[PDB]
Design a protein around this ligand. Structure first.
Ligand SMILES: CN(C)[C@@H]1C(O)=C(C(N)=O)C(=O)[C@@]2(O)C(O)=C3C(=O)c4c(O)ccc(Cl)c4[C@@](C)(O)[C@H]3C[C@@H]12
Ligand SMILES: CN(C)[C@@H]1C(O)=C(C(N)=O)C(=O)[C@@]2(O)C(O)=C3C(=O)c4c(O)ccc(Cl)c4[C@@](C)(O)[C@H]3C[C@@H]12
Ligand SMILES: [Cl-]
Ligand SMILES: [Cl-]
Ligand SMILES: [Cl-]
Ligand SMILES: [Cl-]
Ligand SMILES: [Cl-]
Ligand SMILES: [Cl-]
Ligand SMILES: [Cl-]
Ligand SMILES: [Cl-]
Ligand SMILES: [Cl-]
Ligand SMILES: [Cl-]
Ligand SMILES: [Mg+2]
Ligand SMILES: [Mg+2]
Lengths: 198, 198
């Protein structure tokens, strides 16, 4: 079939939903495209470069709240951004594992730069703005993962019994959204304090 | 060599530091113990059961702030617990990936039950106490991971340039500890509010 970049990525994402990250191989990617392994290699050198590519395209195709809206609050931007990043990670099987094994890439450079500039324009130091952005990022990847490598594994005292019922009634959305607010109000308490003891 | 449980786990952890999670195989575990593959199989049926075992023993050997101290505040307990869980995950190569692929096990049942009871005794609902515990857990696993599958990968605009310098001056400890406080103050703001609009 066509082996332009955007066709190869299309096929590899389709393969990732079928196999999960651990079973995604270049060998299986060549079979799906109808080509011999040395043909694929001219296009894709290894699994790592494939995964680097998928991590970037997943956000480029599906992460549509990369950037704050005109005049949006930093609070509203972190909420929207986090929700967008979660949805984009959940869209493909092992999406979070695909994300984690990858470089904040040339192509994204100016997106992540804009995010940091926006935090500093809203009264954060670079360090504290980066700590907020990183915290939201780590919390969000941790939640999405838990689910996703949860499901991978499977292919009581009473409170733990009720809690596993609770955590498995939606798919971590409630718990995700409640922690998101907790974390944002924490940053705002920190920001407002300045040099006051808090 | 000896193939009691605690010897097999000792050898497998030693293997995990040498290979990382992706290269840990039962075949390599049998070679390290000086035994044939069918001998290992009587003891260990597959990689998954091995990883299930390692995840539990890692916390049992190294997570020493599972339980709150006599009269400790819930705030102080979440801080200490999170720091303990981070240290225990970082102790072995791909520790966080080992954690994620595993069941809150029979053996841990009463530990995690105690944590939830302690939150409800401190004025949290079961749901809100579970949301706090889960948030701390997801944030902590997300941070530790980023590092660990960061390093796996490797084997600029100015703010991003300074920020990668910042994130890579300690090993995420500062950023981890700052988000930890943000998250705890967020839970306390939520808890104190009751039914007030907040
Ligand atoms: C989830 N959200 C907060 C951020 C986001 O929306 C991103 C985006 N491409 O739109 C990211 O790349 C992020 O999701 C993302 O992945 C980031 C990230 O991985 C990262 C790493 O690894 C190292 C240094 C930095 Cl400065 C970053 C960093 C801050 O750029 C984050 C940003 C987040
Ligand atoms: C990091 N810390 C907050 C907790 C902790 O210290 C644990 C421990 N064994 O000492 C955990 O198991 C935890 O680190 C841990 O791993 C938990 C966990 O995985 C989990 C899962 O997967 C499903 C349901 C529940 Cl209720 C839990 C849960 C709440 O027990 C958490 C607890 C945390
Ligand atoms: Cl072509
Ligand atoms: Cl193309
Ligand atoms: Cl491969
Ligand atoms: Cl294959
Ligand atoms: Cl707003
Ligand atoms: Cl023996
Ligand atoms: Cl034993
Ligand atoms: Cl194996
Ligand atoms: Cl092997
Ligand atoms: Cl205390
Ligand atoms: Mg990232
Ligand atoms: Mg866990």
């Amino acid at each position: 079939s066509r082996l332009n970049r955007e066709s190869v990525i299309d096929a590899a994402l389709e393969l990732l939903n079928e196999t999960g990250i651990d079973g995604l191989t270049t060998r299986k990617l060549a079979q799906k495209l109808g080509i011999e392994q040395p043909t694929l290699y001219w296009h894709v050198k290894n699994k790592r470069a494939l995964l680097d590519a998928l991590a970037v395209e997943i956000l480029a195709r599906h992460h549509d709240y990369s950037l704050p809206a005109a005049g949006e609050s930093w609070q509203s931007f972190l909420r929207n951004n986090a929700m967008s990043f979660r949805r984009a990670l959940l869209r493909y099987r092992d999406g979070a594992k695909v994300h984690l094994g990858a470089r904040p890439d040339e192509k994204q450079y100016d997106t992540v730069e804009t995010q940091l500039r926006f935090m500093t324009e809203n009264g954060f130091s670079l360090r504290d703005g980066l700590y907020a952005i990183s915290a939201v990022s780590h919390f969000t990847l941790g939640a999405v993962l838990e689910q996703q490598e949860h499901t991978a594994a499977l292919t009581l005292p009473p409170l733990l019994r009720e809690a596993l019922q609770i955590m498995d009634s939606d798919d971590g959305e409630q718990a995700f959204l409640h922690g998101l607010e907790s974390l944002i109000r924490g940053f705002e308490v920190q920001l407002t304090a300045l040099l006051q003891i808090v």
